[PDB]
Amino acid sequence: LPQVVTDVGVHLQKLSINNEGTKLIVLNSLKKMVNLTELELIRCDLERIPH
Amino acid sequence: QVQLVESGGGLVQAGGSLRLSCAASGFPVYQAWMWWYRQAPGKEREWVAAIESEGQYTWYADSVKGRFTISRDNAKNTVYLQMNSLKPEDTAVYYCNVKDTGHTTNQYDYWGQGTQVTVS
């Protein structure tokens, strides 16, 4: 997840990431956003629900 | 473009350990379901090893089941195949085969150049 996306997610309502099966790592990067209503993660290959 | 090159093929006495390697191209090694094929002299080309994408499941023919181990290694775009205690029937020419391309542009299938392995 980019730094710019994390910065802009402070006022983001819907976040959608379609990684096409590419492995994605959050590494404690979503707690910055607290106004998100949608967190679609299609084909993010998480293998684990992020903490 | 997309291309594959075989390496590690060479003559070796029976009972030795061989580690064939392949040099791949822009198509992801993590993706691009991959094959290790053999063509034996006085025989028709027959599939040996199969490594899958998104799960890394191994497939083998019955004649090559038990003493052949295939794997795909990323961050270097490599496909490896280890044979231990090869029997005289293993003498053939081994290729790397791509039947599915990468995530995008899904380019056609290309056969590898191949290396000849001999068992004495």
UniProtKB/Swiss-Prot annotation, chain A:
It is found in: Cell membrane; Lysosome membrane. Disruption phenotype: Increased prenatal and postnatal mortality, growth retardation, and multiple tissue abnormalities. B-cell development is slightly impaired, without affecting B-cell function. Mice however show a cell-autonomous early block in thymocyte development and impairs peripheral T-cell expansion and function. Conditional deletion in germ cells leads to abnormal sperm and male infertility: the cytoplasm of late spermatids appears swollen, preventing reduction of the cytoplasm during further development into spermatozoa. LRR repeats lie at residues 10-32, 33-51. Ubiquitously expressed. High levels detected in the bone marrow; lower levels found in peripheral blood cells. Highly expressed in pancreatic beta cells. N-glycosylated. Belongs to the LRRC8 family. Essential component of the volume-regulated anion channel (VRAC, also named VSOAC channel), an anion channel required to maintain a constant cell volume in response to extracellular or intracellular osmotic changes. The VRAC channel conducts iodide better than chloride and can also conduct organic osmolytes like taurine. Mediates efflux of amino acids, such as aspartate and glutamate, in response to osmotic stress. Heterohexamer; oligomerizes with other LRRC8 proteins (LRRC8B, LRRC8C, LRRC8D and/or LRRC8E) to form a heterohexamer. Can form homohexamers in vitro, but these have lower conductance than heterohexamers. In vivo, the subunit composition may depend primarily on expression levels, and heterooligomeric channels containing various proportions of the different LRRC8 proteins may coexist. Interact with GRB2. Interacts with NOX4; this interaction prevents the ubiquitin-mediated degradation of LRRC8A. It is linked to Defects in Lrrc8a are the cause of ebouriffe (ebo), a spontaneous mutation that causes male sterility. Spermatozoa present in the epididymis display severe malformations, mostly of the tail. A drastic decrease of the spermatid population is observed, whereas spermatogonia and spermatocytes seem moderately affected. Defects are caused by decreased volume-regulated anion channel (VRAC) activity in germ cells. Oogenesis is not affected but embryos derived from ebo/ebo females show early developmental failure. The volume-regulated anion channel (VRAC) channel forms a trimer of dimers, with symmetry mismatch between the pore-forming domain and the cytosolic LRR repeats, a topology similar to gap junction proteins. The di-leucine motif is required for lysosomal localization. This is Volume-regulated anion channel subunit LRRC8A. It comes from Mus musculus. The chain holds residues 558 to 608 of 810 of the full protein.
